[PDB]
Structure formats: structure tokens, C-alpha cells
Amino acid sequence: SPVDFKDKVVIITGAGGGLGKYYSLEFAKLGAKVVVNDLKAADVVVDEIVKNGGVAVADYNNVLDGDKIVETAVKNFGTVHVIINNAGILRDASMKKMTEKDYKLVIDVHLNGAFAVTKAAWPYFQKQKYGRIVNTSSPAGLYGNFGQANYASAKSALLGFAETLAKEGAKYNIKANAIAPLARSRMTESIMPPPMLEKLGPEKVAPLVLYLSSAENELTGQFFEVAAGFYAQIRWERSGGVLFKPDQSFTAEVVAKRFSEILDYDDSRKPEYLKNQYPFMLNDYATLTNEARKLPANDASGAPTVSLKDKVVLITGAGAGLGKEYAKWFAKYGAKVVVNDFKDATKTVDEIKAAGGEAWPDQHDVAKDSEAIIKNVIDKYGTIDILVNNAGILRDRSFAKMSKQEWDSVQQVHLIGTFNLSRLAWPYFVEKQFGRIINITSTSGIYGNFGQANYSSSKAGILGLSKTMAIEGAKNNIKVNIVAPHAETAMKNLYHADQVAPLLVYLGTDDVPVTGETFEIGGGWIGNTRWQRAKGAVSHDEHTTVEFIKEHLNEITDFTTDTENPKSTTESSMAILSAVGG
Numbered sequence: 001s002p003v004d005f006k007d008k009v010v011i012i013t014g015a016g017g018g019l020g021k022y023y024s025l026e027f028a029k030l031g032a033k034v035v036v037n038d039l040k041a042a043d044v045v046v047d048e049i050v051k052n053g054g055v056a057v058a059d060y061n062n063v064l065d066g067d068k069i070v071e072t073a074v075k076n077f078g079t080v081h082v083i084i085n086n087a088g089i090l091r092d093a094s095m096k097k098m099t100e101k102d103y104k105l106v107i108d109v110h111l112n113g114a115f116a117v118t119k120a121a122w123p124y125f126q127k128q129k130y131g132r133i134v135n136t137s138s139p140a141g142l143y144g145n146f147g148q149a150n151y152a153s154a155k156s157a158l159l160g161f162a163e164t165l166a167k168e169g170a171k172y173n174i175k176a177n178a179i180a181p182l183a184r185s186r187m188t189e190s191i192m193p194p195p196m197l198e199k200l201g202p203e204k205v206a207p208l209v210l211y212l213s214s215a216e217n218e219l220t221g222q223f224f225e226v227a228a229g230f231y232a233q234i235r236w237e238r239s240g241g242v243l244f245k246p247d248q249s250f251t252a253e254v255v256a257k258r259f260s261e262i263l264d265y266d267d268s269r270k271p272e273y274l275k276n277q278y279p280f281m282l283n284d285y286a287t288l289t290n291e292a293r294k295l296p297a298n299d300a301s302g303a304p305t306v307s308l309k310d311k312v313v314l315i316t317g318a319g320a321g322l323g324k325e326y327a328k329w330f331a332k333y334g335a336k337v338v339v340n341d342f343k344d345a346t347k348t349v350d351e352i353k354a355a356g357g358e359a360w361p362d363q364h365d366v367a368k369d370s371e372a373i374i375k376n377v378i379d380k381y382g383t384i385d386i387l388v389n390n391a392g393i394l395r396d397r398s399f400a401k402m403s404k405q406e407w408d409s410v411q412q413v414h415l416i417g418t419f420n421l422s423r424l425a426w427p428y429f430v431e432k433q434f435g436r437i438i439n440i441t442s443t444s445g446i447y448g449n450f451g452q453a454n455y456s457s458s459k460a461g462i463l464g465l466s467k468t469m470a471i472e473g474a475k476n477n478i479k480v481n482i483v484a485p486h487a488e489t490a491m492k493n494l495y496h497a498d499q500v501a502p503l504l505v506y507l508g509t510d511d512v513p514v515t516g517e518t519f520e521i522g523g524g525w526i527g528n529t530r531w532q533r534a535k536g537a538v539s540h541d542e543h544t545t546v547e548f549i550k551e552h553l554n555e556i557t558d559f560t561t562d563t564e565n566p567k568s569t570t571e572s573s574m575a576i577l578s579a580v581g582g
Contacts, residue, residue, distance in 0.1 A: 003214050003546045006031035009077040010213070011070065013063050013117060014087030016041030019136070019181070022202035023084055023209055028054030030210070030546075035059050035073045035080075037087070063087045063109060066116025074124070082132045082213045083121050085114040085158065092147045095426050095472050103150045103419050107411075110154030111457065114161065115407055122174075122400055131174030132213045135162040137223065138180050139569040142234065142531065144467025144516060153415060155180075156464025159223060161457040163448025166221030168399045175220035177212045180234070181205045182227035182573060191573045192228075196580060199228035204544055207231075211549035221280070221448065224556070225533060229544065230576050232536030233557045236446065237565070238283070238520060240267040240274035241527030243292040250498070250524065252333065252505045253303035259506070262519065263528045265565075278532065278559070282443035285486055285523045289494050292524030308508055309334035312381040314373070316340040316366050316421065317391035321489045324348045325497035326390065326504055331357030333505050335386065338362055338377045342391075366391045366417035374424040386508045387425050388438040389418040399453045407454045414458040419465060426478075435478035436508045439466045443484045443520060446529060459484075463518065470516030471568075479515040481507045484529070486522030495522045516567070533572070535562040536579050 010027050014020045016038030024034045028049045034056040036042045036049075042058035049056035059072040073080040089109040091102040114135060125131030140148050141155025158178055165176035182188060184200050192200070205226050211217055212224075225232050242261045244250045255262075267275045273287050308330060318327040319341025331337045331352045337359040339345040339352070345361040352359035360380050364372045366389075377384050393413050395406040418439055429435025444452050445459025463482060470480045485500040500521050506512060518529040537555035539548050549556070562579075566572035 003211065003216055003550055005210070005214060007033065008081045009033045009035070009073050009079055010082040010084065011035040011037060011073055011080055011117065011121070012084040012086055013037045013069070013113060015045060019202045019205060020084070020086040021045050022206055023086070024056065025049065026206050026210060028056055033077045035069065035076070037061060037063070037069050063113025064116050066113065066118070067120045069117055070120035070124070079124050079128060080121050081130055083118055083134070084209065084213065085117065085133065085135045087113050088136070091150060094147050095149055095423065095469060096430070098149055098423065100420055100423070103153070104416065106150035107154050107415065107461070110151070111157045111161070111461070114158060115457070118165065119399070119402065125169070125174045126172050126400060129173050131169060131172065132217070133162070133165055133174065133176040134209055134212050135176065135178040136181070137178040139182055139225070139572055141464050142180050142223070143567060143569050143572065144464060144471050145569055146468070146471050149419065149465055149468045152464035152468045153419065153461045154464070157415070157457045157461035160445045160448050160460025161453060162223070163221045164450065164453045164456045165399065167448055167450045168453070170220065175217060177219060177221070178223045179205070179208060179212070180223060180225050182225070182576065187569060188573055191570065192577055196228045196577070204228055204539070207544050207546045207549050210546040214546070216550065225536070225572060225576065227576050228580060229539040230536055230580050231549065231552070231556050232534045234531055234533040235278055235559070237265070237530050237532040238277050238279050239263065239265050239528040240270045240276050241525055243274070243288065243295060244298050244524045244526070245295040246289060246292050246496070246499050246524035247297065249298040249300070250502055251298070251300055252306040252502045253300045254298040255502050255506045255526070256306055256509070257300065257303040259513070262526050263514065263517065279447060281447050281449070282486055283520060283525065283527065285495065285525065288525040289523030304511065306506060306509055307334050308386070308505060311335045311385040311508065312338065312377065312383055313386040313388065313508065314338045314340065314377050314384055314425070315388040315390055316417070317342070318348055319344045320347070322485070322487055322497045322500070323390045326388065326501050327359065328352055328355070328357070329501035329505050330386070330388070330508070331355070331359055336360070336381050338380065340364065340366065340373060340391065366421055367412040370417070370420040370424050373421060383432065384425055384428050385434055386436045386438070387422065388504065389421060390440045391417055392440070395454060396451050398451055402453055410454040411458050414455070415461040415465070418462060422469065429473070429478045430476040433477045435473060435476070436512065437466070437469065437478070437480035438504055438507045439480065439482050441482045441484045441518065443486070446484060446518070467516045474515060479512055481512070481515060482518045483507070484518070484520040486520070499523055531566055532559060533564040533566055533575070534558050538580055538582070
């Protein structure tokens, strides 16, 4: 018998047209009870369904009102089993033009609407011990994309959100996945021939969406590229990495000496604890630091000079803890450091100056006052060269009990604040054709982590944001890199901030040879993090079914051969052309 959906209640946000409308029709054809949500338009879809023998009701709500949407499903059908997070909206602009409101609007619909709807769906999933969630990402979420700083931030966030829901959801038989469907754009239309472009639509996406939405599906926490008959799983590949002895000899200059080793994925000759991994959580730091501590002293002989002399560094959340130490490293390498902190920047400043360094306080809130922070920097030192967006809070909670306040405040500090500050630094960087942005992500954002749906989603927002800003920055010599440290403070220490800071100051130099890159780091260890995309399956039929996904799953999830490591939407699209081309 075929893949079954009978009597499954299915909420699809933004279902008045495009992908969302198609899914509504396909689901209902297979006997599902669809809640068609669209902010008239929903009615049009609900009429086709009923006319053609199906069950559907309309919901007119804003996706922020996720409680009311699910309330619609419950009234009409007694529960919900599937959420398809589809609702969207575009406000494209380069980093030069994009406003704060353009940014928050796109985060709201894509990310905060998903939180609202899913949060509301969650009790019902828990009680019946069943749920199926599909988060709509996009290639711009995976890779960054020019002019879409927001949209990439939201679509990338939804990766980490999906991983977190998959981890929290497992015991309740709730599985969560993300898709990244390639769209017709100017880029695609210049890479792909007319026959593939006309298959680049909902009919070729929906089969995987249905499959991932079914009881038969066992896959969870996973991402997939989908386009014109192609379907392939795409996962994280983290390099074997390098170990440094975690002592005074672990300097910024040794990193620079051995930098290329970090991004080197040939792990043939390395031992087992430093082979490439395909991870689902942070690295085995206990093994790593244990091995790093057996090493002889880091040799800095032949190392590149590292100096941040007369560079102005702005670092946020640096009044205490890890950030405080990071700053002291930036200052000891010669930078004039504006130390931002919401509570107190004084103690970091005093300590910096007691060591013969130059620093200056700022105590504005990042999200709220990015303008006042940039003015503060310029008033004092006349310019800005390096931005390290480190500000943070933690509001940990199971997803079932996470409140909206806990969701937003985390989001405001980590994601919004990083953008708003970055946006106001930006014109200075481009004017002088120099900028070095160092954004702090997290293994909780990259791999997801139960109890941290907010922290993880936001820090995963950072990947998309950073990557975009790296694309746009390249021509004006503005490099932006991403870092997921493992380090603790006091509240011996094998994971000091001293084991992370060296990388951070190197990322600030003139001669840092990469941009858009992701690093995980701690305990004497440094690694890089990238994509590996599977062989994939190709449907050649002009109608593709959910059955095709079922029968060719082996090929979709096959990392044994013909894999790819795309790092831009252009790279992915060329590779998809090649697999479909045969």
C-alpha cells in the first residue's frame, strides 16, 4: 500500500499560493485534513480542496498568532499532527541599504512565525505522542546570498531550530527536518537550461515534503537540497583539526603559522581523534585537550607577524567572563579596544590599561543603541576596523515551557544586535576598504541542542548572516568569519578563553586569507565546519510521487560516493545541474 496520510491534520502557513498552496492540494488529495493559513486567498485554496473531494478549513491569521492557527486545527479537527513551516516574505537589500525594520520583519515571518505555530502545536504533539515538522529553509540559508542578509538569517536559523526540535521531540515521536528548495532567480536562470528551469517548481519539491511529513518517515534533524527532480541530504562535515599545546606558547602567531591545517580535509595521515567527522554535537574536547597537553611547546619559528597596532576593535559583552579576556588579547596585540558591556565595561578597561594597553568603555545595549555605540567609537578613536559581536545572554528552557519573552530576548541580543551593530559599522569599513568582522556562533546553533531552542536558532541565524556579509564584503576587503568556542570561566580549567582568543585576533589581521568560514575551537583544538551533500537521487518522470522519495531514499542519503562540498548557491546549483545532467 502507498504512503499514508489519511485523517492527518496538517497546518500549512502561507498556503494561499506557491509551494504552500500546492502542498495543501497534494496533502488533501491523499486524505489529509488541511488547515490552509494565509494572511480570501485561503478561501480560494479551501474551495478547490472541497470541490475536489477533500477536507480543509481556512485560517486568516498572522503567523505570529501561531496559537490561533493551531486553535483553528483543534476546533475543526480535534488536534494537529503535521506543521509545514512555509509562510514567507522578502525585503531584499544590500548591507548598504537594508534597514533594521527590513531585517526584523523578515526574521519575524520566517523564524518567529515558525516558533509561534510550532510552540502551539507542541503540547498536542506531546499528548498524542506524534508529530511531523518541516521547516522551509533555502540555499541562501545554507550558504549566504548577496542582498538577503535577513532572509539568509531566518532560513539559516531554521536549520538549528529543526535540529533542536528533532532532539527534544524524539521521545514523543516528533521528527523535525528542513528543506532548501532552489528557486528561479537571475542566478539560477544563468546557470541552468530551460527544461530544468520549468521543473524548478512545487511539483518537484512536494514529494520530499510529503514524505518527510508522513508516519513512515524515520529521518529527523536533517537538511535536504531539492530542485527539478534532484533530492540530496546535506550535512555538516567538521575537519579533523589541529592541536596546539594549551600553554603560553599557544599564540596568535602559531595559529597563523599553522592556519591552513585547520581548513585541511585530507585526514589520511592523522590519528583517529583528529579524523574528519560528520557531527551532531560539539567535539570530544576531553580527548582533544588531553592529547594537546602531551604535545611539546608550540613552535612560533617562521611565524607571520601578527599585530593589530592602530586598529580600533569594538567588542560587545566584554565587561566580564570570556569577552573580557578576548578584549585583553585584542589590546595586548596593540588595538585600541572599545569594550561594550550592558552592565559594566569598567573592570575590563581598567585591567587593559593596567597592562599598558588602550581601551575605552561603552555601556549601551546592542540591539537598542547600535547608533550610540558606533558614535561612541568614532568620537573617541575616529574610526573602526574590527568588530567582534560577542554580546550574549542565556535563557534556557525545554521547548514545551519556553515563553515568548525567553525566545525574543535571546533573539534580540544575539541575532538582531549583531545585525544592527554590523549595519552601522559597515559604511566605515567600505569607505576605508577595510573591515574584519568576527561573529560568535555556537555548536548549539550549528548542531542544535535540547533546552536551547532560542539560543540555538539565533546562533544559527548568525551563520546565514555572516556568510551573506562575507559575500558582500569581499570586494571592499571586508572579511567576516564565524567562531563556535568551547570555553568556561568560573561560574583546573581545561577550556580557558586563552585557548580561543588567539584565533580571534588572527581573524582580525590584514592577511587573514579566508572569509565566510566557520570554526569550532577549544582546549587547544581548532577545526573548520562546512557542508557535505549526498550523491542524491534524480527523478526523470514528469510527475514525481512521494513513492519516488520512499524508493530512492538510499540515494538521497548516500555519502559513500559522488559527494559535494558546496559553499555558495552558485556552487550548489552547478553541482545540481551536473547530477541532473547525468
